Symmetry: C3
Subunit: 342 residues, 3 copies
């Protein structure tokens, strides 16, 4: 909601209040899930070419008691400059360039978008990331955009890995970089490829699974969007990058996602999708499946401010020594929600 | 404060900044008490009959250091639909229907409203609560309203009680339901009754006091409001529902509250009230008093945005083995405050 | 940004999003430093003479993971009344009157302002502080202002020191008071003096260094501001008030700060400053330096909403047994930032 516009400067106070409930045999996901988001977006005019911006986004959980702890966190926070034609530059806590392509399939009612995690190198939201983007290849080629980003090291809490912003091994990282490229081929058809590479840290190599100096990703995608039809698919291959439960990293893995949906003029929007993550050579566990399920659900829009939804996750995983040790869930889940947004 | 209204949608950013100070011989309540609340309220027009809404409210303490922890929590968070005549429906973190009646006496300057607590079954604010309300009995009877709500189970943090939203025994609960009914008899005279009942959990029965399968409440109230006079009283009887300090639950107890106040045209609003909670059969402690005091204070309004107040709690409890073991306070308290609200 | 003004009441929603990065050999300060501030300011008209106000300010860090803890805190929170001529009165979490003078030198791009800390008696931000201020000596003398404040005791977490708002020894305090006086001599020349005195607590005297019943400060300052020139200096002498690393308090110490800067009409604002804190009689460590460095940097303004900066701290301290035991840093630091504010 735009709440201020005057003298070259403008503001946006936005967010949502989601009433969620989960139904599952898995006791650590079953129950109330209500939460809420709050955010701010700014834009200031400097010249006829230069223009500054900034954005912050917060997540506040509302399913526990008034005495509970660690209930809220920050998802995004950054500042940048926009140069009209030559592109844009920003820095802070933001999305890794890999998401530029993998977001094409992150469009389910509740689930989905989980063959990666956050603070997982440059695959999703991350700390201290400098980003440069260019739009229609300067004004020349239409619909051809690309980006280049660098991320500094986020070490341990003490010892030598250490950096002021210390976290645990599964969320650490060394210096790295990545780039993406997308193109609008013709009518509602787009294609894209993105690559990333970064240094691993000492603590990471002293973990149960995974061994290497570098962490890498190669990802390509395709998408169709027109005439109330949405069709998208993504494929990505990783080397010492995707987490294997709580045990460590997969030496090599292959991820695949597919989504399809239709938009009825009267509000209903049914959806069907499928996804899986397969790991190879897991230090004595051989070849295992890390994630695998079929999702079926639908969402109803009252208007651009209110909606309801139902989502149904059908788990295809088999209970075994691996899933048990890694802490990976194998049960089904059903979500039901009511949400208001401004 | 309404900060946005345009195209069928409207917003409210509200709250307050309270400068509080407590004077007491009880060392764990004596001292600075400054805090602040922030909230948001929305409303979107859908049809000539349908209309969606949402509300969030946060509490942020300001009496400790910039390095202290667990200083802020969420009080309310929910979304609903309003059907014009047929009523309304909402879900999330909200008030239990019992408060529909007991709030009649929760009108003191600082103290009062404490024969119950929060996250105490359906007596005050609680997690994951679905609520349906109907206004003038459809349009037919004027001033006759009622409500019906259901609350899902909020288990332990692990083991089998467990649910994703795990908390400790004194704040757990099983599936339950409750209803309330209020009626405007004539000139500034209202009456109301509310009943609730819910399942208890394993962990709750392994506590020092209290034993049972169900937790129940029966509450009735009366109120007079007109000609600058305010008179209200509430009576409620519980079974395995009211907490007995930190030891467990009272097998049966009786709660009573009375408040009276006058509003001078020039701003001053003096107040006098009295309340007590009496417990029966406390597993070897017999019959004891759980709470008991007389309150006298007054508040001054500069306008609808600023005010000052003083409150004086006169504790009638006697120091003994019970109050000592349960952790119940027996000293007096004096509050003094300055508050600004928007 | 003023987002509401109507019917005698007005609101301000303000803040900033700062993209920061530190470069240092000191591993506990090196790395990402991104954070963000959010605040609210209100003002309500009561009479032709009376007028109420309120302010809150929050700090939210954005350089760690979505699972990290203790990432946000409250800096200010208070309410007051303004009496037109006779002055003003407010209470809550606010600045100590000593800052009225020492702020004259707290104007560096990133560093500086550190010969004191927060929750350090009445030298910076503190809990439960009642403040009275008077402007032009009632309307009589122009540019001559003064203030008088009292701060209640902030004890320990338990035992007898205890108060509801319990914190650790280095941040405790007893009852105290302080006053300041400033005067505008002539053209862009001001001078000021401020004094404070408060009782120490038991826990504070059982610390490794420092011994006394009272904590005191005597501070005087001078400033020149005109024709794009800024010149300021501050001197203050303490008795059992300035912290000596993590070991305790200095029995007596002397602090000195100097800053100088020039404002080019086209946006650039270079700056040079120097500061040091010298401690005397440190229970067997003799006379030591507690802080000492030279700072050189500059900031560029795109407009009243966007800016960039670089800051360079040149540490003059020598590595020794003292600095090592107290936990005092001896390396250099370089900051680089991009910031948007509203
Ligand atoms: C058997 C019908 C029961 C009807 C109960 C109506 C409750 C109205 C309460 C009015 C209190 C003054
Ligand atoms: C006009 C006064 C109406 C008060 C209603 C009292 C109802 C008492 C019900 C007792 C049920 C046990
Ligand atoms: C549904 C209406 C029930 C009316 C019961 C009135 C009981 C009043 C008791 C007041 C106790 C302080
Ligand atoms: C006009 C007030 C009528 C009060 C009626 C009271 C009915 C019995 C209430 C019993 C409460 C324990
Ligand atoms: C005219 C005032 C009527 C007040 C009624 C109080 C009812 C108290 C009920 C106590 C039941 C044990
Ligand atoms: C208007 C005030 C009504 C007061 C009714 C007295 C009820 C006393 C209840 C005592 C419960 C043990
Ligand atoms: C409604 C307020 C009445 C206050 C009367 C106080 C009487 C104190 C009696 C104490 C008995 C233990
Ligand atoms: C206006 C006078 C109201 C009197 C109400 C008396 C209630 C006293 C309660 C004492 C319980 C022991």
């Amino acid at each position: 909601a735009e709440i201020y516009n005057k003298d070259g400067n403008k503001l946006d106070l936005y967010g949502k209040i989601d009433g969620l409930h989960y139904f599952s045999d898995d006791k650590d996901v079953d129950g109330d899930q209500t939460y809420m988001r709050l955010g701010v977006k700014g834009e200031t005019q400097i010249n006829d070419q230069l223009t500054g911006y900034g954005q912050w986004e917060y997540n506040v959980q509302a399913n526990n008691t008034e005495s509970s702890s660690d209930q809220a966190w920050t998802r995004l926070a950054f500042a940048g400059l926009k140069f009209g034609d030559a592109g844009s530059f920003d820095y802070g806590r933001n999305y890794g360039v890999v998401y530029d392509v993998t977001s094409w399939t992150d469009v389910l009612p509740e689930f989905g978008g989980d063959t990666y995690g956050s603070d997982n190198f440059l695959q999703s939201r991350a700390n201290g990331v400098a980003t440069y983007r260019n739009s229609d290849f300067f004004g020349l080629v239409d619909g051809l955009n690309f980006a280049l980003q660098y991320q500094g090291k986020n070490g341990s809490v003490s010892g030598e890995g250490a950096t002021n912003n210390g976290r645990g091994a599964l969320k650490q990282n060394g210096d790295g970089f990545g780039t993406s490229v997308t193109y609008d081929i013709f009518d509602g058809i787009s294609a894209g490829f993105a690559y990333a590479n970064s240094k691993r840290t000492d603590d990471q190599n002293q973990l149960l699974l995974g061994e290497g100096d570098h962490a890498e990703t190669y990802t390509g995608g395709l998408k169709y969007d027109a005439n109330n039809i949405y069709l998208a698919t993504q494929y990505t291959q990783t080397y010492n990058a995707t987490r294997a439960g709580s045990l460590g990293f997969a030496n090599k893995a292959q991820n695949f996602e597919v989504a399809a949906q239709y938009q009825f003029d009267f509000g209903l929007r049914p959806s069907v999708a499928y996804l899986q993550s397969k790991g190879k050579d897991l230090n004595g566990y051989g070849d295992q499946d890390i994630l695998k399920y079929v999702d079926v659900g639908a969402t109803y829009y009252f208007n651009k401010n209110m909606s309801t939804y139902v989502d149904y996750k059908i788990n295809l995983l088999d209970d075994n020594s691996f899933t048990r040790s890694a802490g990976i869930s194998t049960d089904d889940v059903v979500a039901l929600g009511l949400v208001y947004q401004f």
